[PDB]
Structure formats: C-alpha cells, structure tokens
Amino acid sequence: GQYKKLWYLLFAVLAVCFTILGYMGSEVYKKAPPYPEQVVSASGKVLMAKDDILAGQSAWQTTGGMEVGSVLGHGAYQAPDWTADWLHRELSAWLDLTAQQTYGKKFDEVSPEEQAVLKTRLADEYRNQSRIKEDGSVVISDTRVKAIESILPYYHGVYGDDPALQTTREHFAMKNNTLPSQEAREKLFDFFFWTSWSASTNRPDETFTYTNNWPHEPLINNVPTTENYMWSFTSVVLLLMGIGLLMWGFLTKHLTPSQKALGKYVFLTVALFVVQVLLGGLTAHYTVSDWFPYALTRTWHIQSAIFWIATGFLTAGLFLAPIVNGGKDPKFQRAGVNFLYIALFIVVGGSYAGNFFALTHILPPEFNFWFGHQGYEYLDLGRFWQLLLMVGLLLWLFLMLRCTVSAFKEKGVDKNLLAIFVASMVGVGVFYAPGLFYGEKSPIAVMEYWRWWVVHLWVEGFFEVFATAAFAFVFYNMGFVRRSTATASTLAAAAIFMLGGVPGTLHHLYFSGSTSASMAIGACFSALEVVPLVLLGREAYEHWSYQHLSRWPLMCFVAVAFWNMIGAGVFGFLINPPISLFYIQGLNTSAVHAHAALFGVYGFLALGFVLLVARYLKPNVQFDDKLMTWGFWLLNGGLVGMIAISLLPVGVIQAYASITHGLWYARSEEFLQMEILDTLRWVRTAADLIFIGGAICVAIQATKIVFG
Ligand code: HEM
Ligand code: HEM
Ligand SMILES: [Ca+2]
Ligand SMILES: [Fe+3]
Ligand SMILES: [Zn+2]
Ligand SMILES: [Zn+2]
Ligand SMILES: [Zn+2]
C-alpha cells in the first residue's frame, strides 16, 4: 500500500537483527567449551571419558537439573550454583594439599607471602592447563585428583542420604536422596567437574575462561574480562543517550459457535493461574512429604505460568478470528477449537504427571528426556509433550489464519492493518519451534542458545507484537483510532519491539560458554528496548490523566506499562550490563526481574484478555466492582510487597558478598542460612498471601461471568 516505507523499514530490522542472532549462534556451536575425550591424571588414571560427563548431564536432568540449583548461572536460587560450589572446593582442597607438601601447614598457618605464592601456581595449573588440541584430551596433576576425591564425599552426602548432611539438604530444599543411585551420582559429578573446568580454564585463544571468567573466583582471578568493561560502558552510554533523545523535556495533547466455545478457555487460564500462585507459595515455603519436593513445586511454578499466560493469549486471538471474518466461522472452527483445547489439556496434565515420576526415579532414566523432566528452566516438559504443545500452537495458527483469507477478499478496503496483524499471529504460532532443536546430550552451550529463542524472543518478542496488533485492530474497529493510525503505529512498534528484542536475547549467554562477542551484541541492542518502555509509559501517562473516554481497561493497560518500566526497565537494565551480570547472575536479583517482568506485564495483559472475552461471551452478566478492585490491588501491592521487602533486599545483600568474596559465597549454605536473610525470607509469606488473595479474586470474578 502507501506504507511501503515502514514495510521496508521492518523488513530491514528483521534482516539485520536475525543475522546477528544467527551468526552469534554459529559461533556458539563452534567456540563452545567442548566435552573432553578423556581426563587423564598425568600419571594415567583417566578420571572420565566423554560420556562420563554426557551421562552425568543426562543424570542431571533426572534430578530436575536447573530446578534444584543453578549450573553455569542458570537455575534455581535455594541450592548453590554447582559449577561455582564445585570449583571453589576443588581449588581450596587443591591448596590445602600443596600448602602441606611444600610447607607442611594448612595454608592458614602459611604466611601471606607464601599464600599468594601458592595461588600463582594454582592459577597457572588450573587456568593454563587447557584442552589439548587435535586430540581433545585434558591432563590433570595428582594433587588435583586427590582434591576432587576429598570433596566427592560431601557431594554424595548431599545428593544422597549420608545421614551427616541432613540439614545441608534441608537448607538447600532437597528431598533426601535427590539422586538415590550412587551409580549415577559418580557421573553427575563428572558433569559438575567439567562445568567447573569450563569456567576455570582459558580458551585456546584467550587469557580468559570459556565462561568469560565466570564465575567470580578470587583464587584464580576469575575477575571481569577486559572486553566486559569495554562493552558494559558502551551500553550505559547508549541507554543514557537513548533516554536523552526520546525524553528531552511534558503534558502532551493528543457471536458465532466457535467464539462461544472459548468460555472454558477463560476458565482454564484463571484456573491454572491460581494453580500456579499456590504452587508458588508452596515452593516458597520450601525455602524456609516429598513426593512433590522443592524441585517439583518449582517446576510447576515455572510451567503453569507459560501455559496460562500463553493460553490467555491464544484465547484472545481465537475470539477475534471470527470478528475478522465479518462475523461468521468459515468451516468447523468450533471443531478445531475443541481439538486444540483437548491438546492443551493433554500437554498440561500429561507433562505434570510425567514430571512426578522422573523426580521420584519411578520413570526409567531412558524415557527421562521425553516423558520425564528436561532439567532445563522453562522447557522442563519432555520432548514429547513439548512437541504436542507445538502441534497445538500450529493448529491455533491454522484456525487463526483461516478466518483472515476471507477478509483478504473485498476489492475496496485497505488490507494493511490486517497484513501486519496476520504476521503477528504467525509470530505467536510458529516461533515456539526454535526450542525443539536440542537433544538430551546436546552441548549445554547450544541448548542455552535455543532455549532463549523461546524464553526470550517468543514470550517477549512476538507476544509484545500480538498484544499491540490485536489492540490496534480493536481500537480502530471500536472507532477510537483511524485506519491510517492503528495501521501505521503497529508497523512502527513491530520495528521497535524487534530491534532490541531479536539480538538482545544474548544478554542470557554472556557466560554460558560464548565468545566475548555475546557481551557486545546483547549489551548494545538490549539497551534499545528502552524506547518502547519510555514511549509506552509516556503515552500511558498522557492518555491517562484526562477525561474524554469512560472495570475500565485503562487501569489494566496502565498497570501494564508501569511494571514494564519498573521490572523490564529498572530491574532489567540494572542487571543487563555484562559488568553487572558477571556478579549478580544466579542471584535473587534475577528473581526480582522475573516476577515483576513476567507477571507485571504479560500476566496482566493475559488476564485483561480472558476477562474481556468473558465480558463478551456472557454480556449483561454484571461484574463485581468490589472484587475487581480488591484483586487489582492485592495483585499490584502484592508484587510490590514481594519485590520490596524480601527479594530485592536479599538480592542486594547477595550482590554485595558476591562482589567482595566471590559468588560461591553468596550461594554458600552458611551465607543463605543467615540472620536477616532467613527473616527476609519469612516476611515474603506476608505479601505472598496478599498476592494469592487478588489471584483468587480474579479467578472468582472471572468464573461467575462465564458461568451464568
Ligand atoms: C505469591 C506468589 C508467588 C510466590 C510465592 C512465588 C515464589 C517463587 C519461588 C519460590 C520461586 C523460585 C525461587 C528460587 O529458585 O529459589 C519463584 C521463581 C519464579 N516465579 Fe514465582 N512466585 C509467585 C508468583 C509468580 C508469578 C505471578 C509469576 C508469573 C507468572 C511467577 C513466575 C516465576 C518465575 C518465572 C520464576 C523463575 C525465576 C528465576 O529463575 O529467576 N511467580 N517464585
Ligand atoms: C519485557 C518482558 C520481560 C520478561 C517477561 C522477562 C523475563 C525474564 C525472566 C523470566 C528471566 C529469568 C530467566 C531465568 O531464570 O533463567 C529474565 C532474565 C533476564 N532478563 Fe528479562 N524479561 C523481560 C524484559 C527484559 C528486558 C527489557 C531486559 C533488558 C534490560 C531484560 C534482561 C534480562 C537479563 C539481563 C536477564 C538475566 C538474568 C539471569 O540470567 O540470571 N529482560 N528475564
Ligand atoms: Ca533461573
Ligand atoms: Fe532476556
Ligand atoms: Zn537451619
Ligand atoms: Zn520488548
Ligand atoms: Zn497520546
């Protein structure tokens, strides 16, 4: 049409940004910490082969993987980071040993001058004994092997049942015998070791580790890289030079069968939401019987979110589809809508059940990757059920894309608003696919890549787009926006959302085995996602303090903007710069970001859809002004309560000790089980309840709208 300029602008951004994201992926595959063929102990005693690790990886998924504690910065925050906790002990044990044989004292009786003399040896041994090329085999010294075999007892007693370390496990919210088979434990530790190896050893090319010196370990000088600083100030420039430009100031002056089906869709979303916040409190109480332990209550807490939020978005789109098609279903829509609904119930019910058996070792650890627990945060489904939800999303696009070719028919009307909105829904449908391309014993580095195409590009990138696209469609069809307004703004917002979104992804991969390039791309581009925030919060305040148009959605789609500013913005870009994330990755800083960002934005959006559909599916069914009120505030103040008086304080405290002593310490057992940390953990269950309250209210309100 006449918008060809903006269309080319969009095609430009998509071409540019997808290449960066593609390239930085090829380099993930190439220059990722390889699994060694064998770990030989100078003498000969091979400690492990290739599959000694790859098994311990498979064995890690068995426990719930990232659902117990973090590994390489990614996971859960009650247990320690295993890659950090491993490296630290394996170093300390190495020292005590060499301080003995050289001076005959336990390093603490050895004088400052000598301590620092030992650590020089330590760093050279550890950091400069890199994977021998052309025959990828690694060679260790004997004082190290003795070091490992003196810490393995503790790890067997924590992942097991050794009665000594009972409260240890309890402090880590771990059900006694998290891995009952000492068969597998032996292998899990070969994985735990190799991770710690990838994080403590220089690349073939550099004087930093495969993990860009992650984590922060003073005893081998795992200090921020050099390129770290170069780019983590670049980005802070860009951001500020961003805000300066955008803001240079004020107070500106501008029913058919299928549709009727969506009632149970609405119910599902509120149902599942309240299923989730419960499981949330449950898994929150574990941080202060274990058929369903911490590892499980958390897994569902993560899983229900994606579902109920995604489902709310699907549901919305399904309602609009007939409305697009004049006002009539083309064929057996209602039929496909029922199929889809079954599907979604088979994925949700299916997975949850599968999860139960894997984390009790009832499922055979040969079906573990497909029907058990993937061990990978946000994708702990099982390759089968994940494909089933994939098929489901495909069907949703099928049903979706049908109603649209009927409106691509008339000769008169401008088919541009449609055009972009059509791409939008594809975005939702097709783009869960990336996270398919990784196997059981796929390199951790690679899985880490694709996972974030989903947990980042999908739920942030394409949902962002769909929200605005559907909004524009409605906003124009309601008649509060002209054609050449709603049509135009969608095409720009699509360009803006995607500019920071696409390459930004890489803010996840700064340390999980990438080239220092990751810090460059991620840091720069993710700084541009500032203009969407400012723009929204700007307009959202402008279109607010006014009387012109009048349980009103502005509430919903203002709160949205607000959290998109506190959570995606403040807490998001506080943690975005490589220099920062180098310390506060895997700390309660991320917990803040997540809660405020996921619920605060996409939670409300999702809830404001299923609510809107219910207001249309059962009209003249009168809302409750007191419920909606109570809810809208307990939820808001609730999130405010969670982040303020618990998560952030701890995050802060963690952040500090991470920086002063090392990360291993901010994750260490004694540090966690502390005076005010344990207390700040308690104060949470105050605002936890408040939150569940508003959650109940919104399910309750929603129910009595769809049912009667
Ligand atoms: C009272 C309500 C809630 C409570 C008590 C709660 C509690 C928790 C707990 C215990 C964790 C795990 C922390 C750890 O690993 O140690 C967590 C993480 C998480 N929660 Fe919630 N949660 C609540 C509401 C929500 C909501 C509304 C959402 C959004 C749908 C959500 C999404 C998440 C996500 C995505 C994570 C993973 C965070 C990360 O790995 O950094 N939670 N929450
Ligand atoms: C807009 C909606 C957003 C949502 C729903 C969201 C969601 C999340 C979630 C759930 C995590 C934790 C993942 C995990 O446990 O492994 C996370 C991490 C992160 N997000 Fe966001 N995010 C959003 C926007 C942003 C923005 C705008 C930035 C840019 C500053 C950003 C930067 C980050 C960074 C740097 C992390 C790293 C945390 C870590 O790996 O420990 N996010 N995000
Ligand atoms: Ca996490
Ligand atoms: Fe991200
Ligand atoms: Zn205790
Ligand atoms: Zn965004
Ligand atoms: Zn305006």
DSSP secondary structure letters along 493-532: HHHHHHHHHHHHGGGG-SSSS--THHHHHHHHHTTTTHHH
Helix (H, G, I), strand (E, B) or coil at 262: coil
Q: Is 244 annotated as a binding residue?
A: no
Structure-block tokens of residue 507:
């803010």
74 bridge partner residues: 71
User: Residue 215: which of 708, 693, 679, 658 has the closest Cα?
Assistant: 658
Write out the E strands in 133-209.
138-139
From ligand 6's centre to the CA of 460, what distance in Å? 5
Q: Is 170 annotated as a binding residue?
A: no
From ligand 2's centre to the CA of 576, what distance in Å? 8
User: Residue 500: which of 469, 464, 472 has the closest Cα?
Assistant: 464
| For ligand 2, atom 43: residue with the closest CA | 594
| For ligand 2, atom 8: residue with the closest CA | 594
Look up the domain containing 682 and give its range: 1-32+224-708
Residues 9 and 48 in one domain: no
Phi, psi of 147 (to 5 degrees): -70, -45
From ligand 5's centre to the CA of 171, what distance in Å? 6
Each residue of 622-656: b (16+ CB within 10 Å) or e? eeeeebbebbbebbbbbbbbbbeebbbbbbebbbe
Q: Please tell me the distance from the alpha carbon of residue 309 to that of residue 277, in angstroms, as a whole number.
A: 13
Phi, psi of 217 (to 5 degrees): -125, 105
DSSP string, 28-81: HHHSS-PPPS-EE-TTS---B-SHHHHHHHHHHHHHTGGGTS-BTTBS-SSSPP
DSSP string, 555-571: HHHHHHHHHHHIIIIIH
> Considering 223, 247, 273, which residue would you say is the last residue of a domain?
223
Residues 491 and 423 in one domain: yes
Q: Where does ligand 1 bind, in terms of residues with CB under 6 Å? A: 76-78, 277, 280-281, 283-284, 287, 298, 301-302, 305, 590-591, 594-595, 598-599, 603, 688, 691-692
Q: Please tell me the distance from the alpha carbon of residue 411 to that of residue 454, in angstroms, as a whole number.
A: 38
From ligand 4's centre to the CA of 572, what distance in Å? 9
From ligand 6's centre to the CA of 104, what distance in Å? 58
User: Residue 464: which of 577, 344, 613, 597 has the closest Cα?
Assistant: 597
Residues 6 or more apart whose CB falls under 8 angstroms from that of 463 comprise 313, 428, 602, 605
Q: Which ligand is nearest to the CA of 287?
A: 1
How many distinct structural domains can be found in the chain? 2
DSSP string, 669-693: HHHHS-HHHHHHHHHHHHHHHHHHH
- Determine the atom of ligand 2 nearest the C-alpha atom of 572: 30
Residues 6 or more apart whose CB falls under 8 angstroms from that of 294 comprise 68, 76, 78, 173, 174, 175, 283, 286, 287
Q: Is 254 annotated as a binding residue?
A: yes
Residues 218 and 233 in one domain: no
From ligand 6's centre to the CA of 459, what distance in Å? 9
> ∠ CA(334), CA(338), CA(343), 5° rounding?
145
Q: Which ligand is nearest to the CA of 80?
A: 1
| For ligand 2, atom 37: residue with the closest CA | 508
Residues 265 and 192 in one domain: no
Each residue of 501-518: b (16+ CB within 10 Å) or e? bbbbbbbbbbbbbbbbbb
Residues 557 and 704 in one domain: yes
Q: Is 543 annotated as a binding residue?
A: yes
- Determine the atom of ligand 2 nearest the C-alpha atom of 586: 41
Q: Which ligand is nearest to the CA of 597?
A: 2
Q: Please tell me the distance from the alpha carbon of residue 265 to that of residue 261, in angstroms, as a whole number.
A: 8
Long-range (24+ apart) CB contacts under 8 A made by 45-52 are 45/145, 47/140, 47/145, 47/148, 47/190, 47/193, 48/190, 48/193, 48/194, 51/441, 52/187, 52/190
Residues 447 and 477 in one domain: yes
Residues 190 and 312 in one domain: no
Residues 515 and 382 in one domain: yes
Structure-block tokens of residue 171:
């402090």
Residues 204 and 261 in one domain: no
Pocket test for ligand 1, best of 74, 301, 304, 646 (most atoms within 8 A of CB): 301
Ligand 2 lined by 239 (C-beta under 6 Å): no
> Considering 183, 204, 223, which residue would you say is the last residue of a domain?
223
Assess contact for 68 and 297: CB atoms under 8 A: no
Residues 296 and 436 in one domain: yes
From ligand 1's centre to the CA of 170, what distance in Å? 20
Pocket test for ligand 2, best of 564, 574, 593 (most atoms within 8 A of CB): 593
Residues 208 and 278 in one domain: no
Q: Please tell me the distance from the alpha carbon of residue 18 to that of residue 394, in angstroms, as a whole number.
A: 22
> Considering 223, 239, 257, which residue would you say is the last residue of a domain?
223
From ligand 4's centre to the CA of 506, what distance in Å? 7
| For ligand 1, atom 24: residue with the closest CA | 277
Q: Please tell me the distance from the alpha carbon of residue 219 to that of residue 208, in angstroms, as a whole number.
A: 14
- Which CA distances in Å does 200 have to 84, 223, 357, 546, 643? 10, 11, 36, 58, 33
| For ligand 2, atom 11: residue with the closest CA | 594
Question: Identity (one letter) of the amino acid at 333?
Answer: Q
Residues 188 and 244 in one domain: no
User: Residue 268: which of 358, 346, 370, 355 has the closest Cα?
Assistant: 346
Residue 544 is given by DSSP the state T
Ligand 2 lined by 590 (C-beta under 6 Å): yes
Q: Please tell me the distance from the alpha carbon of residue 646 to that of residue 680, in angstroms, as a whole number.
A: 5
Pocket test for ligand 1, best of 585, 589, 595, 696 (most atoms within 8 A of CB): 595
Each residue of 433-461: b (16+ CB within 10 Å) or e? ebbeebeebebbbbbbbbbbbbbbbbbbb
Residue 164 is given by DSSP the state G
CATH (domain of 283)? 1.20.210.10
Sign of the dihedral through C-alpha 83, 587, 642, 609: negative
